[PDB]
Structure formats: structure tokens, C-alpha cells
């Protein structure tokens, strides 16, 4: 099962460095090249550069000089990218790929390594109940919500009624306002019974060992 296996998710402040591993297994390492591509959120996948594994010499894409190192260890069959002295615009997932010398393509891709760079410190969420302020013209459907505010790092996990108000739910992707994360989740109940039946959202935040349950109440 010819693989390029990569290390874990990494979370660093500005100014420390990172060393992603990329271990090939099941292929003559020296007959292919290892390429490192970086996917930046919303930005195109930048190829970063290639390392020729016979000769050992890197070929940096010009845009990556200085902080970006490429090194390997052929008994070990491993490839390394070390981004020295990290700065917040680098927060991307890094892929390593073997390139084929004949057709010049990347045919085996590695799983990917996320580097999150933030100066932030681990914050608990503030979970606020969002309920209709006397608001009636929905149809016979009501929409409660939970606003998960200011946490760090990701993820939180919002459920509703401990996993049983499943359809109707819509959790939105975390956007970071001001150093920290903010997210929201909504549920469309049939109003026949609400506020008659309970509706509570449940926010787990593993990185701070915080679970929060808030009953959404008409007021």
C-alpha cells in the first residue's frame, strides 16, 4: 500500500520552527522526487519546491528562500520540510508528493500537515442562547441558536439535545474575530411544541475541558 505518511497537526506561536516528516514506504525512494505543495486557505496550492533524492539538492521556489529548509534521511526513507521562524501568514496544510521523472506529475500524495500559527492562549467559549425576541413569522417552524464566542484553539463541538435534534441543525464554520474563534449553530424545530419541549445546545471544547449546556428558553 504505497504511501507517503506525514506527521501530525502542529500549533506554534510566531517565531518557533516546525519539522514535518514525510516517510515513503513501498517504493524505491530514489527513483522519484519529493515535492512539497502548500495549500493556503482560499489561496492557490503553491508548489514550494522539490528535493532530488539521488544527488540530495533542493530546488527552492524563489518565493520560499531563507526560512524554508528541505532535508532527508534515505536509510530512514524520510523527507523533511522545516519552516524556521514561523509567522502567521504560513498557516497552511503542507503536502509532500512523489513526482515521476518521466511524465512529470505528482502521483502519490501525502495525507497533509496543518500548521496553525497564533500567539493565542487557550480560551474557554462563551456560549450565548439566541432565541426569538418575540418573533413570530417563521411558518410553524422556529429557529433557536447558540453563539459560541471567543475560544482558542479549534475545535468545539455543538450538538442539540445531546445529539437528538440532528436534522434542523446547521453549525457554521469558525471564523476568528480578533485573535480568537467565534462560531454559531441553529436548529429549526416544528413550533407545535416549543417552548413546551426543551431545546438545549451542548458545546464541548476539548482544549480547555469545558462542556457547557444552555437551555434555549423563550426568554
Amino acid at each position: 500500500q504505497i504511501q507517503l505518511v506525514q506527521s501530525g497537526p502542529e500549533l506554534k506561536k510566531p517565531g518557533e520552527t516546525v519539522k514535518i516528516s514525510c516517510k515513503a514506504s513501498g517504493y524505491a525512494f530514489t527513483n522519484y522526487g519529493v515535492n512539497w505543495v502548500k495549500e493556503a486557505p482560499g489561496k492557490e496550492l503553491k508548489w514550494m519546491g522539490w528535493i532530488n533524492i539521488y544527488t540530495g539538492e533542493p530546488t527552492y521556489v524563489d518565493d520560499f528562500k531563507g526560512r524554508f529548509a528541505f532535508s532527508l534521511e534515505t536509510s530512514a526513507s524520510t523527507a523533511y520540510l522545516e519552516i524556521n521562524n514561523l509567522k502567521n501568514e504560513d498557516t497552511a496544510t503542507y503536502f509532500c508528493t512523489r513526482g515521476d521523472y518521466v511524465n512529470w506529475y505528482f502521483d502519490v500524495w501525502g495525507a497533509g500537515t496543518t500548521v496553525t500559527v497564533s500567539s493565542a492562549k487557550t480560551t474557554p467559549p462563551s456560549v450565548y442562547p439566541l432565541a426569538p425576541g418575540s418573533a413570530a413569522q417563521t411558518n410553524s417552524m422556529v429557529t433557536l441558536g447558540c453563539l459560541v464566542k471567543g475560544y482558542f484553539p479549534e475545535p468545539v463541538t455543538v450538538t442539540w439535545n445531546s445529539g437528538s435534534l440532528s436534522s434542523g441543525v446547521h453549525t457554521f464554520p469558525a471564523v476568528l474575530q480578533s485573535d480568537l474563534y467565534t462560531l454559531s449553530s441553529s436548529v429549526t424545530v416544528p413550533s407545535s411544541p416549543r417552548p413546551s419541549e426543551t431545546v438545549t445546545c451542548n458545546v464541548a471544547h476539548p482544549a480547555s475541558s469545558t462542556k457547557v449546556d444552555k437551555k434555549i428558553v423563550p426568554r
Binding site: 515535492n35 505543495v37 492557490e44 496550492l45 508548489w47 519546491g49 521556489v61 503536502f95 511524465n103 512529470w104 506529475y105 505528482f106 502521483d107 500524495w109 501525502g110 495525507a111 497533509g112 462563551s126 450565548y128 442562547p129 439566541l130 432565541a131 426569538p132 425576541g133 418573533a135 417563521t138 417552524m141 429557529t143 441558536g145 453563539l147 464566542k149 436534522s167 446547521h170 453549525t171 457554521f172 464554520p173 469558525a174 471564523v175 474575530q177 467565534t182 462560531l183 454559531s184 441553529s186 429549526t188
Partner: protein, 216 residues
């Protein structure tokens, strides 16, 4: 360096339909050694890219009889005959004919369906938040099709610009729509010195751009 340009960015398709993604290069992709290195990838959600086609018209292994590649010089086209649930993903195109390789922004294959309108709902900054001194107002803009929608947060007359965080869901798997949430945030104080808050939502459907307010 040779900027690869795909268009569309979404391609609404009904499963069963023929689809044709297309890509354009900003230089020729004919190499001195007489060969074109335009390759196509598929990236299904949160995953690796996957070689689909090498040098314009060659399936890679696995890739089914259902896919074609063509074009020359600067223009190329990927084509799926019967599109099926297993091809939905972002298709990107890269070139290795010139140094460094470059990719194109991709076009995501999306399911086609029936225009839906936003079930808009608007909420005032609760008791708990107010006590801490902040105040977020939140509009859920839900279950609509297509994807564009424009949020206009108008607090009285003076509309706010500078405090929005809007977000987005990928196509909802179950009955294929999108939901969005705008969230305006204020300090508690500014907030208690305006009385109206309207979530003016402009989706190509309701020609009275759908407006929902609460006045403090």
C-alpha cells in the same frame, strides 16, 4: 509564472448529466521535447489531491472510461460522461511544462437543484452577553440556492460596515442548499444607542430583498 485559469468555480450538475470542466494556460504548454504536461487532479473533502489524467488525454490508473481530456497549446477540457455521486469534488489543473509547476483555482462539482429562498431569522444580544459589555446581533440566513447572497446590516439609516463576520456551510448533503450566518458585533454601549437592526438579505429570488428587523 504560467497562471492556470479554470472557469467556472461552481458547476451545478444533475447526476446523470455530462459535465465538462475547462482550464486555460497563460503560456503554451508545448515543451521543447514535443509534449504537453497538463495534468488534472480530484480533491474530495478534507483530502489529498489525486492524479486523474497525465499529459492532456491519458487516464491514470483507476480513473474510469467515463473521463476525457483534450485541448492544445493554451486550452484544455476535462469531460465526465455520466457524472455520478463519486466524482463530486474540486477539479484542479496543473502544468509541469514550465518551471515551477503551477495549479489552477479549481472548479467544484456541485449538485444542481431548485432555487430556494433564505429562511432569514434575526436575534438580539442576550442578557448574558450584555452583562459582559459586548453585544453581538445575529442573523441566520438559511436554506437557500444558489450560493450568492448579500448581507446588508443597516442599524437605522446608517448601515454598518466595519464589524461583520459572515460564514457559510458547504452544500448541505441532505436536500442540497446552503446556509449562512451573518453576526454583527458591538460593544454593549454602541448597541444601546440605536433602536433598529435589520438584516437586509439580497438573494436573486425575492425582489423585495428580504428584510428582518427588531427594534431594541
Amino acid at each position: 509564472d504560467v497562471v492556470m485559469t479554470q472557469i467556472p468555480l461552481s458547476l451545478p450538475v444533475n447526476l446523470g448529466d455530462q459535465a465538462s470542466i475547462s482550464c486555460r494556460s497563460s503560456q503554451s504548454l508545448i515543451h521543447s521535447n514535443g509534449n504537453t504536461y497538463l495534468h488534472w487532479y480530484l480533491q474530495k473533502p478534507g483530502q489529498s489531491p489525486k492524479l486523474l489524467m497525465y499529459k492532456v488525454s491519458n487516464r491514470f490508473y483507476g480513473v474510469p472510461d467515463r473521463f476525457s481530456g483534450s485541448g492544445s497549446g493554451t486550452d484544455f477540457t476535462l469531460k465526465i460522461s455520466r457524472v455520478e455521486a463519486e466524482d463530486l469534488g474540486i477539479y484542479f489543473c496543473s502544468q509541469s511544462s514550465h518551471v515551477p509547476p503551477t495549479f489552477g483555482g479549481g472548479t467544484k462539482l456541485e449538485i444542481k437543484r431548485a432555487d430556494a429562498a433564505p429562511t432569514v431569522s434575526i436575534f438580539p444580544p442576550s442578557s448574558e452577553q450584555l452583562t459582559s459589555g459586548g453585544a453581538s446581533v445575529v442573523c441566520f440566513l438559511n436554506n437557500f440556492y444558489p450560493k450568492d447572497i448579500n448581507v446588508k446590516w443597516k442599524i437605522d439609516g446608517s448601515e454598518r460596515q466595519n464589524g461583520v463576520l459572515n460564514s457559510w456551510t458547504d452544500q448541505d448533503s441532505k436536500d442540497s442548499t446552503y446556509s449562512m450566518s451573518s453576526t454583527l458585533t458591538l460593544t454593549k454601549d454602541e448597541y444601546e444607542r440605536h433602536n433598529s437592526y435589520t438584516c437586509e438579505a439580497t438573494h436573486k429570488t425575492s425582489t423585495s430583498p428580504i428584510v428582518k428587523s427588531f427594534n431594541r
